[PDB]
Design a protein around this ligand. Structure first.
Ligand code: NI
Length: 341
């Protein structure tokens, strides 16, 4: 059964609600982005209208085989009427094709559903500038002040400089980057660009990337692993055993691996600066965990919410324990008392 924080009152709509069967009263199912916890349940047998971005619709059609007649892509930053209700899709600064959804209810209420997002001051100059928001369905993944991490730009600077130094010292070093979902493509694209290489990967991952509308992508990626000195591998293989096994397969072309694991936050963020990050090393293999986040830090989340000034907040992450719920509610009240709304 579909939980309350996935339902939009006064409409026939749900958000990210595909794992509950036929939801009673739902006339249109919105999908914010192509991550498995959110799409859980979609397939070629789905026969209701799905509303989403262009990029998410390319992924539904090619990767899950949802039929075309049930895919309804909407352009971003554009007022659209869906089943008699005005909606707008906004870029969520999460993975490719991820949106937030503004719903203008028939009674005058305005609701913002963030989906998953990484808040940014640039959102303060979107179509959100123009009207009041009564209710905020908020991605609370990192809603506690311990959750700090650097900008995406600092993280990429670190990765490019680390990879270029290692391969210039040793032209026989291979770089490997882990992945298990869409998102974080800048990590492997930026490293391949500095090295003058295409990125090599499996046919299954190439297919996924080909759905993303990335400019000049045919110039950046390949399935010919032999031509490439940046390889993508499943995240599960980014360990000393999996990397050893991969280096054997490369036919003595290489004698060293440098590997990257983009994680979200890890407790090593509470002590160490990005500049000071060091790898784990065994022999000729070194693994870096890099804190490349596609979710808001605590401070980015707090700034956005204090700017938006919603009348009510409904968390969509960390909802399963009383302790998490009580912690999140305390921060929401602090924010409101400090800013005066
Ligand atoms: Ni996500």
């Amino acid at each position: 059964t579909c939980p309350f924080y996935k339902k939009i009152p006064g409409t026939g709509f749900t958000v990210d609600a595909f794992q509950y069967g036929v939801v009673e009263g739902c006339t249109a199912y919105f999908l914010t982005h192509f991550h498995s916890d959110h799409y859980a349940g979609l397939s070629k047998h789905f026969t209701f209208p799905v509303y989403c971005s262009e990029i998410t619709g390319n992924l539904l059609k090619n990767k899950l085989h949802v039929q075309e007649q049930y895919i309804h892509p909407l352009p971003l930053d554009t007022e659209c009427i869906v089943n008699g209700v005005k909606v707008v899709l906004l870029d969520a600064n999460h993975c490719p094709g991820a949106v937030m959804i503004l719903f203008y209810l028939p009674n005058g209420t305005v609701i913002l559903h963030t989906g998953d997002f990484r808040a940014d001051p640039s959102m303060e100059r979107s179509l959100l500038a123009d009207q009041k928001v009564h209710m905020l369905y908020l991605d609370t993944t990192y809603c506690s002040p311990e959750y700090t991490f650097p900008s995406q730009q600092e993280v990429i600077r670190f990765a490019i400089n680390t990879a270029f130094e290692a391969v210039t010292l040793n032209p026989h070093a291979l770089v490997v980057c882990g992945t298990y979902s869409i998102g974080k493509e800048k990590v492997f694209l930026a490293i391949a660009d500095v090295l003058g290489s295409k990125v090599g990967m499996s046919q299954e991952k190439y297919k996924t990337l080909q759905c993303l509308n990335i400019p000049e992508i045919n110039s950046l990626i390949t399935t010919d692993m032999c031509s490439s000195l940046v390889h993508l591998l499943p995240m599960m293989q980014i360990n000393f055993k999996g990397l050893q096994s991969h280096l054997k397969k490369c036919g003595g072309k290489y004698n060293q691996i440098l590997a990257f694991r983009p994680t979200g936050w890890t407790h090593s963020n509470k002590f160490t600066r990005i500049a000071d990050v060091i790898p784990q090393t065994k022999g000729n293999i070194s693994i870096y965990g890099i804190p490349y986040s596609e979710h808001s830090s605590y401070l980015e989340m707090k700034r956005f919410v204090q700017w938006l000034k919603p009348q009510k907040i409904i968390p969509t992450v960390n909802v399963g324990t009383w302790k998490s719920r009580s912690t999140m509610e305390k921060y929401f009240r602090e924010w409101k008392l400090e800013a005066g709304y």
